[PDB]
């Protein structure tokens, strides 16, 4: 490679793999599985807008905090679900689901909430029809933490520090995801991004 | 594969960075001077542009291009409309702006005017000026903020180069029909 | 050879003979030659056991300190002998000898003392026979100092320090030679060594 001046004389710079231990520690670490899933932020906002945005009408949950669906204390699982059942006036009750998959150092949490056709629901109310409406679609939010491949000398204590580091990256990621003025479009029906000049 | 390096690491950053493209080309300096000399020097007569700022001809907003042109039309008495062109090429970290303005034969133009005869005249030649910035080879460590700093560094070298090119008394020959360069004594 | 990390980069370890001066100084050094040989330790012990151990009867020396036999002051020799003559009751007198050889940096001192057949001597005394007994065998002890090949920069003064170093190794060697309890066999008629477990 390039040439520089060492005390022996002019010496060639060199790039070597000598002295780098890339060995990894196996993803064999049991992790804490919450006994319920708190959806407080989303449901307080849904109470704020009165469970209706435009033509999307939403169901009222059973609880702001979701109970486990297929998780039992003391039984290890790689897939766990929490669920409640949204209900509403002239709405067929429909479940809202929070899924957690923990495999090979990869943790992934997904949230799926359904909605209904407000045009149909208000037609039902206004002309005094006796039927109900089934869900029309959903919205989904996924979050993923790739925490595999810790190094071999990673202390049992230092894995907790790494835990907190990843959780702070999580917070930063969601903030960057929703960052922006609420005067302007930023999430739904997205086509492309346009950052403003000033 | 991760390797520890002793000495210089020459890894360069790939030339894969979009750059800002002006929505129009301002030519204010040259056209104000052309108005100053009444669009005529010696036997060279020039045409009057439609605008001092040239609109894009083949550039569409939001569409990346590696070659773009701004253009206007010079018109004149007893003259055939001739376009003045500003070309910008961006490729592989090298960005180059060229300016081409045509001229006409003043003897033909004023002979027609003085003879009151139907002829009109086309351009005889042009003058061209090129400017080139070789910005490739950014090192690996450089982040975006540092790249902005390098942007401004190159633009300052640009200004220095133009000043060094035009440097000299206006009493004396310095650009056109150049044969060689000579330095004065004391 | 093996690989290690030097400031130039990964560097191969190397073993060279560069910068080692093994030149030696010739063994051309006159040494002191004692004017007599003191055998005080052995002869005081021989007085202790009354010049008799088992069937080995020993002669009584002329002197505890032996005079030179072929050494003359101011004459350089590479071989010198000291001697006295043991005598005894009904014993034909017999010489005890101490030999010193000094050649080419190697000093060697040997001691040879004879003994007689006590069975024969006490037969003579007991049945009142008029004859005498001649020596029957001997015991010998050798000591050797290989002090050749001093280095070239060895100062004349430092050769005295080396002298004393070798003499201290001598003392340590004799102590290791006779080391051991006197309850147990350690020197004569030796067949092999057996160091005790505890």
- Cα–Cα distance measured from residue C43 to residue C86, given in angstroms and rounded to the nearest whole number: 11
Ramachandran area for residue C193 (φ above 0: left; ψ -120 to 50: alpha; else beta) = beta
**Strand pairing partners for B88?**
B68, B97
Candidates A70, A81, A78, A72; CA nearest to A37 is: A81
Whether the CB-CB separation of B114 and B108 falls below 8 Å is answered with no
- Cα–Cα distance measured from residue C29 to residue C104, given in angstroms and rounded to the nearest whole number: 9
Whole-Å CA distances, A119 to A42, A90, A136, B166? 23, 13, 11, 72
- Does the CA dihedral B44-B47-B51-B53 come out positive or negative? negative
Half-sphere exposure of B86 (CA within 13 A, CB side): 19
Instruction: Tokens 């894969």: give the residue.
Output: B16
The residue in chain B having the minimum alpha-carbon distance to the alpha carbon of residue A193 is B62
Q: Does A169 touch chain B (CB under 8 A)?
A: no
Q: Does C76 touch chain A (CB under 8 A)?
A: no
* Tokens coding A27: 């993803």
- Cα–Cα distance measured from residue B4 to residue A20, given in angstroms and rounded to the nearest whole number: 8
* C-alpha angle C6-C8-C13 in degrees, rounded to nearest 5: 40
Instruction: Tokens 């509403």: give the residue.
Output: A88
- Cα–Cα distance measured from residue B167 to residue B176, given in angstroms and rounded to the nearest whole number: 14
- Cα–Cα distance measured from residue A31 to residue A106, given in angstroms and rounded to the nearest whole number: 11
Whether the CB-CB separation of A108 and A142 falls below 8 Å is answered with yes
Task: Give contacts of C9 with chain B, Cβ < 8 Å.
Answer: 6-7
Tell me, rounded to whole angstroms, the distance of Cα B11 from its chain centroid.
33
CB-neighbour burial class of residue C145 (10 A; exposed 0-12, middle 13-18, buried 19+): middle
In eight-state DSSP terms, residue A180 is: S
Nearby residues of B61 by Cβ (< 8 Å), 6 or more positions away? B23
* Tokens coding A159: 């894995």
**Strand pairing partners for C79?**
C101
- Does the CA dihedral C4-C6-C9-C13 come out positive or negative? negative
Candidates C90, C97, C95, C85; CA nearest to C117 is: C90
**Strand pairing partners for C60?**
C87
Candidates A120, A112, A99, A118; CA nearest to A138 is: A112
Instruction: Tokens 């191969």: give the residue.
Output: C12
Exposure string of B4-18, with b = 16+ CB inside 10 Å and e = fewer, is: eebbeeeeebeeeee
Interstrand relation of C24-25 and C150-151 (parallel, antiparallel or unpaired)? antiparallel
The residue in chain B having the minimum alpha-carbon distance to the alpha carbon of residue A17 is B3
Touching subunits of A (3+ CB pairs, under 8 Å) are B, C
Whether the CB-CB separation of B74 and B45 falls below 8 Å is answered with no
Candidates B56, B51, B50, B52; CA nearest to B22 is: B56
CB-neighbour burial class of residue B184 (10 A; exposed 0-12, middle 13-18, buried 19+): exposed
**Strand pairing partners for C54?**
none
Exposure string of C69-92, with b = 16+ CB inside 10 Å and e = fewer, is: eebeeeeeeeebbbbbebebebbe
Whether the CB-CB separation of C64 and C43 falls below 8 Å is answered with yes
- Cα–Cα distance measured from residue C54 to residue C94, given in angstroms and rounded to the nearest whole number: 20
Exposure string of A64-87, with b = 16+ CB inside 10 Å and e = fewer, is: bbbebeebeeeeeeeebbbbbebe
- Cα–Cα distance measured from residue A107 to residue B163, given in angstroms and rounded to the nearest whole number: 61
Candidates B42, B48, B34; CA nearest to B78 is: B48
Resolution for this PDB entry, in angstroms:
3.3
Candidates B105, B96, B91; CA nearest to B42 is: B105
Q: Does B33 touch chain C (CB under 8 A)?
A: no
- Cα–Cα distance measured from residue A60 to residue A47, given in angstroms and rounded to the nearest whole number: 9
Whether the CB-CB separation of B138 and B144 falls below 8 Å is answered with no
**Strand pairing partners for C102?**
C107
Candidates C44, C110, C97; CA nearest to C68 is: C97
The residue in chain B having the minimum alpha-carbon distance to the alpha carbon of residue C5 is B6
φ, ψ for residue C171 (rounded to 5)? -60, -45
Nearby residues of C87 by Cβ (< 8 Å), 6 or more positions away? C59, C60, C62, C93
Instruction: Tokens 């609109």: give the residue.
Output: B55
- Cα–Cα distance measured from residue A142 to residue A170, given in angstroms and rounded to the nearest whole number: 12
Instruction: Tokens 């750059």: give the residue.
Output: B19
Q: Does B3 touch chain A (CB under 8 A)?
A: yes
Candidates B45, B51, B56; CA nearest to B107 is: B45
φ, ψ for residue B90 (rounded to 5)? -125, 115
Whole-Å CA distances, A75 to A33, A78, B1, B173? 11, 10, 40, 92
* Secondary structure element (H or E) that encloses residue C160, with its range: helix C158-178
**Number of B:C CB contacts under 8 A?**
4
- Could you write out the DSSP letters of every residue in C3-33? EEEETTEEEE-----TT----EE-S------
Candidates B107, B137, B111; CA nearest to B15 is: B137
- Cα–Cα distance measured from residue B112 to residue B121, given in angstroms and rounded to the nearest whole number: 9
Residues in chain A: 198
Nearby residues of A111 by Cβ (< 8 Å), 6 or more positions away? A39, A42, A96, A97, A98, A99, A140, A141
Tell me, rounded to whole angstroms, the distance of Cα B93 from its chain centroid.
18
> A15 and B3 in contact by Cβ < 8 A?
yes
φ, ψ for residue A90 (rounded to 5)? 55, 35
Whole-Å CA distances, C69 to A21, B90, C61, C63, C83? 78, 112, 15, 14, 6
* Tokens coding C128: 């009142």
- Cα–Cα distance measured from residue C109 to residue C89, given in angstroms and rounded to the nearest whole number: 30
Task: Give contacts of B7 with chain C, Cβ < 8 Å.
Answer: 9
- Cα–Cα distance measured from residue B181 to residue B164, given in angstroms and rounded to the nearest whole number: 13
The stretches of chain A forming alpha helices (DSSP H) are 40-48, 118-126, 158-178
Whether the CB-CB separation of B139 and B14 falls below 8 Å is answered with no
Whole-Å CA distances, C79 to C31, C143, C145? 12, 15, 15
> A11 and C7 in contact by Cβ < 8 A?
no
**Strand pairing partners for A139?**
A113
- Cα–Cα distance measured from residue C86 to residue C62, given in angstroms and rounded to the nearest whole number: 6
How determined?
X-ray
Whole-Å CA distances, B59 to A8, A193, B88, B90, C92? 58, 21, 11, 13, 136
Give the CA dihedral A46, A49, A54, A57, nearest 10 degrees.
40
Tell me, rounded to whole angstroms, the distance of Cα C181 from its chain centroid.
22
Choose the mutation target among C9, C11, C13, C14 for the interface with A, i.e. most A CBs under 10 Å: C9
Instruction: Tokens 């220095």: give the residue.
Output: B160
* Closest partner CB to B4 (pick from A1, A16, A22): A16
The residue in chain B having the minimum alpha-carbon distance to the alpha carbon of residue C7 is B6
3-state helix, strand, coil in chain C (%, to 5): 20, 35, 45
């Amino acid at each position: 490679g390039q040439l520089y001046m060492g005390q022996q004389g002019p010496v060639q710079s060199s790039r070597t793999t000598f002295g780098v231990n890339p060995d990894r520690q196996a993803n064999a670490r049991p992790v804490y599985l919450a006994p319920a899933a708190p959806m407080e932020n989303t449901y307080t906002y849904l109470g704020s807008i009165q469970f209706a945005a435009g033509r999307h009408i939403f169901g009222e949950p059973a609880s702001n905090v979701l109970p486990p669906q297929n998780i039992v204390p003391g039984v290890p699982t790689k897939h766990g679900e929490y669920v409640t059942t949204n209900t509403g006036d002239r709405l067929m009750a429909s479940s809202t689901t929070v899924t957690r998959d923990v495999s090979n150092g990869r943790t992934k949490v997904s949230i799926d909430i359904p909605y209904y056709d407000r045009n149909a629901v208000e037609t039902l109310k206004a002309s005094a029809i006796p039927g109900a409406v089934a869900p029309v679609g959903s919205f989904k939010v996924n979050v993923e933490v790739l925490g595999g491949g810790v190094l071999t000398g990673t202390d049992a204590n230092a894995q907790f520090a790494l835990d907190e580091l990843l959780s702070n990256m999580l917070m930063d990621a969601a903030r960057i995801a929703q960052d922006g003025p609420k005067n302007t479009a930023r999430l739904v029906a997205a086509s492309h991004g346009v950052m403003p000049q000033a």
